[PDB]
Design a protein around this nucleic acid. Structure first.
Ligand SMILES: [Mg+2]
Ligand SMILES: [Mg+2]
Ligand SMILES: [Mg+2]
Ligand SMILES: [Mg+2]
Ligand SMILES: [Mg+2]
Ligand SMILES: [Mg+2]
Lengths: 124, 225, 128, 216, 19, 109
RNA sequence: CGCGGACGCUACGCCGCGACGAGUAGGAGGGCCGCUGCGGUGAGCCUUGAAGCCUAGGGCGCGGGCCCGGGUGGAGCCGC
RNA sequence: GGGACGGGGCCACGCGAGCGCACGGGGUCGGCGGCGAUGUCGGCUACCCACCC
């Protein structure tokens, strides 16, 4: 379940990191990257992940369905957005709001993608 | 329908606005009545000596019912029977002061520690300038100050003591409910005396600071307070 | 002219020197590390006047300005490129400090990647 | 509607009115005043019509914000303070300027500005000190006054006139208003005996002078 | 008039003399 | 074109007998010889002027060789005319007996 | 009419209010202090130079101590 | 009862609406001015030396 494996994963995983009186986490669908109950992506039934495009430009969005939970093959779903700056943030505010799908992760799933759009700019 | 539920919430906001108004007329009237009773209690202790000098007799006033007890000496080198007393008046540091009502059963207790205290009989002003300035409460074994009447009216509502000026009428004229407003007051934290004491050890008679000093203790509260 | 921290608080500290072991300079076999002296004749443990002070806990620092560099950044220790994806969200508070054994053909590709993400690196011109 | 009348009770001390709320009720006559009872903006196109939005959503958030701060009550910006004087300074007195590059010249006071600083104008023929702002704190007041009420000070000169802009060159209006005031002030100080060399010389200490001993 | 249980009608009639 | 300050001879830190607290340094002022006179010298900006080897900047001038340590006068001391002073940085022991200045200009007259 | 509302909560966490702090022999608890080794794990680092030494180089921690830059050195090493 | 023109004080005389000053649940400026490339501005700590205790 969920609270069972948080009581298991919270200290002896391998995606976990400890140095300089700090704590981070390298999960494949995490944001803010830090070990907490709400930002882990392997436990819940519903998970949000925001990644850079495999090409040079764009932002992919890894969702997760509910039907096939134990089938890691077709459990997630990837979409790709390669547009301007406003409507991408609107289509993420809509993906997380108007489906009532895990609404806690909205502002951080906008901040991280406004940092990918800041990132993929041609540097001066 | 969410047309009526708004007005129903506004009734509860107006009923308490009227309850603060009918508590702010009450504290003002309970104060004005006392301001009349303190004139009457000071003048009538003069008038019996003017009529007793018209004839040629004498007017002895009654012995007062309130003393103010300050510790002056330290924690080191203390007699064990003494230290129990100074922990039955709740005087733990140096320079702590309390208010003690008087009787035969508490003069003989305040006699055995004459070398460590300097007690007196306070005036009306130096009760104001100890409640308003250095007066902290005791709420749940803590030390919470006094910035409102509602901090008194929680722990003293069962004695018709709903403000500060009733607690002062109780202390000055010692009412029935003195214990429940003197265990409540945390012990005071006075400062060091300005100018300087004469000599700490000896009695006030031979030029010291200890012992009785019946109305010179307001010359040690205007100095220390 | 740099990467500005988020907020720049006034760092105050309660002691700026070190602690040295008692009778450290008369000998060489005494190191300058701290060892609480446990005699009975002694002057330090019983706090005489004008001697070497001791390390109590009162010299501790405020939890808001603890571990803070003078520039206003905290530190973090990085080996490869893969751990800088950690800091693309926590950016304006913590800084990276590249390890020692990393050779000089990789720092060319780490610092460039750590200029897109707008992450401060404490030692960017290490080897050349 | 209705005119704004002045405040009915006067002020006795700072904070305390002289009338209570009973003589104020009958003074107000509160016996006869009973009381009982945008973002969407459309536009045409020369398709269809488009509805624009005012104050649209951002395009780039930072990775971390800073929180709001609390509210105090009694903190005003500088242009909304009170302005003070000393007791001794009046218009027409004689001052001893101290700290400029005009170190120690005996000068003449005019007025108090709206920002606080003084309007200290020496006669430029005597002390080489024109109309020039100084500060009240740095000025020692020599008890020696002249009459001033027969002047016509211009109304365009203020702090916005002396305030810095950014070598230098003197504007011709400084030469105008300096001559215009000095041609009215100067016959008052010339007609007093032994003053045009007094304003002229400088204050300086020497052996046998202690400031707490002489009165000035 | 003070304690809220009894004098509610007294503050009632005061609300129906103050307007 | 003359002196616009007043003489003041530094005398000692605020010490007890077997301690010392160097953050409050005493002064004597030539002309004053009681505690009743020293109500003129409260809040006056005092200073200290020395000189060194290297060349340093100077506000409104070419870089000279001289340096300063500003300060402030806080309260009286004794019944004779001694007075305390709080400098920003605490003073050296080289100046016991030397000359510091006090100004007058934060006046109250 | 409009499609809008910061931060947080590793619950062994985070935040707030009060009084207190001396200490030998001695007792207990926390140690993201440290050494040498084994199961696990870091798609770890390494002859474009690892351990180890040196240092008037830059810094953090109450402290035990650690980390970085600059020199020598030449083949194996560390964190959780 | 006035005494046949009498001055000061009384928190007496179950939805009223809008505005502003404030000794009011812990500081703000919606205020400014001079110094800056081969000689100068900063660096508490870490190195040598002097002094007060
Ligand atoms: Mg003793
Ligand atoms: Mg004194
Ligand atoms: Mg012994
Ligand atoms: Mg202890
Ligand atoms: Mg060495
Ligand atoms: Mg070999």
């Amino acid at each position: 379940s969920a609270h069972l494996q948080w009581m298991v994963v919270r200290n002896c995983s391998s995606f976990l990191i400890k140095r300089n009186k700090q704590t981070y986490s390298t999960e494949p669908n995490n944001l803010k990257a830090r070990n907490s109950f709400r930002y882990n992506g392997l436990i819940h039934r519903k998970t949000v992940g925001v990644e850079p495009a495999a090409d040079g430009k764009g932002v992919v969005v890894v969702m997760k369905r509910r039907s096939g939970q134990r089938k890691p093959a077709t459990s997630y779903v990837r979409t790709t957005i390669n547009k301007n700056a406003r409507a991408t943030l609107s289509s993420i505010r809509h993906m997380i709001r108007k489906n009532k799908y895990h609404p806690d992760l909205r502002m951080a799933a906008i901040r991280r993608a406004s940092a990918i759009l800041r990132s993929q700019k041609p540097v001066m | 329908n969410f047309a009526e539920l708004k007005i129903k919430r506004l009734r509860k906001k107006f009923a308490q606005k009227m309850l603060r108004k009918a508590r702010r007329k009450l504290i003002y009237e309970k104060a004005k009545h006392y301001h009349k009773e303190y004139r009457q209690m000071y003048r009538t202790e003069i008038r019996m000596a003017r009529m007793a000098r018209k004839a040629g007799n004498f007017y002895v006033p009654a012995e007062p019912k309130l003393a103010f007890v300050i510790r002056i000496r330290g924690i080191n080198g203390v007699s064990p029977k003494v230290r129990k007393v100074l922990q039955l008046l709740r005087l733990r540091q140096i320079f702590n002061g309390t208010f003690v009502k008087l009787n035969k059963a508490s003069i003989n207790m305040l006699r055995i520690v004459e070398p460590y205290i300097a007690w007196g009989y306070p005036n009306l002003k130096s009760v104001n300038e100890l409640i308003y300035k250095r007066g902290y409460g005791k709420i749940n074994k803590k030390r919470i100050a006094l910035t409102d009447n509602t901090l008194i009216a929680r722990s003293l509502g069962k004695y018709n003591i709903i403000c500060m000026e009733d607690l002062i009428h109780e202390i000055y004229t010692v009412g029935k409910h003195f214990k429940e407003a003197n265990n409540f007051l945390w012990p005071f934290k006075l400062s060091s005396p300005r100018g300087g004491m004469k000599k700490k050890t000896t009695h006030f008679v031979e030029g010291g600071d200890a012992g009785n000093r019946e109305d010179q203790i307001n010359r040690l509260i205007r100095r220390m307070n | 002219a740099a990467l500005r921290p988020l907020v720049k608080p006034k760092i105050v500290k309660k002691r700026t020197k070190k602690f040295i072991r008692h009778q450290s300079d008369r000998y060489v076999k005494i190191k300058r590390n701290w060892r609480k002296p446990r005699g009975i004749d002694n002057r330090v443990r019983r706090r005489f006047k004008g001697q070497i002070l001791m390390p109590n806990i009162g010299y501790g620092s405020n939890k808001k300005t603890k571990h803070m560099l003078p520039s206003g950044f905290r530190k973090f220790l990085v080996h490869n490129v893969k751990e800088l994806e950690v800091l693309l969200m926590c950016n304006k508070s913590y800084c990276a400090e590249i390890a020692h054994n990393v050779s000089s053909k990789n720092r060319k590709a780490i610092v460039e990647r750590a200029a897109q993400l707008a992450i401060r690196v404490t030692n960017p011109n290490a080897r050349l | 509607k209705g005119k704004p009348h002045c405040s009915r009770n006067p002020v006795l001390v700072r904070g305390i009115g002289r009338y209570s709320r009973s003589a104020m009720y009958s003074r107000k006559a509160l016996y006869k005043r009973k009381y009982a009872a945008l973002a969407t903006v459309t536009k045409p196109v020369g398709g269809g019509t488009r509805v624009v939005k005012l104050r649209k959503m951002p395009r780039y958030y930072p990775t971390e914000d800073v929180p709001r701060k609390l509210l105090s009550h009694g903190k005003k910006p500088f242009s909304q303070h009170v302005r003070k004087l000393r007791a001794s300074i009046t218009p027409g007195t004689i001052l001893i300027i101290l700290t400029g590059r005009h170190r120690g010249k005996r000068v003449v006071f005019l007025k108090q500005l709206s920002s606080g600083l003084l309007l200290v104008t020496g006669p430029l023929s005597l002390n080489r000190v024109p109309l020039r702002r100084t500060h009240q704190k740095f000025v020692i007041a020599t008890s020696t006054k002249i009459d001033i009420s027969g002047v016509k000070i211009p109304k365009h000169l203020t702090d916005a006139y002396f305030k810095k802009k950014k070598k230098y060159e003197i504007t011709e209006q400084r030469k105008v208003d300096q001559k215009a005031v000095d041609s009215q002030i100067l016959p008052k100080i010339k007609a007093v005996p032994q003053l045009q060399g007094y304003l002229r010389s400088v204050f300086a200490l020497t052996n046998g002078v202690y400031p707490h001993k002489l009165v000035f | 008039i003070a304690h809220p249980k009894l004098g509610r009608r007294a503050r009632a009639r005061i609300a129906r003399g103050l307007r | 074109s003359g002196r616009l300050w007043c003489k003041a001879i530094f005398a000692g830190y605020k010490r007890g007998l077997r301690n010392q607290r160097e953050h409050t340094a005493l002064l004597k002022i030539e002309g004053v010889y009681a505690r009743d006179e020293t109500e003129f010298y409260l809040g006056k900006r005092c200073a200290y002027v020395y000189k060194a080897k290297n060349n340093t900047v100077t506000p409104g001038g070419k870089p000279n060789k001289t340096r300063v340590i500003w300060g402030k006068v806080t309260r009286a001391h004794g019944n004779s005319g001694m007075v305390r002073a709080k400098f920003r940085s605490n003073l050296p022991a080289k100046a016991i007996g030397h000359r510091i200045r006090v100004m007058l200009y934060p006046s109250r007259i």
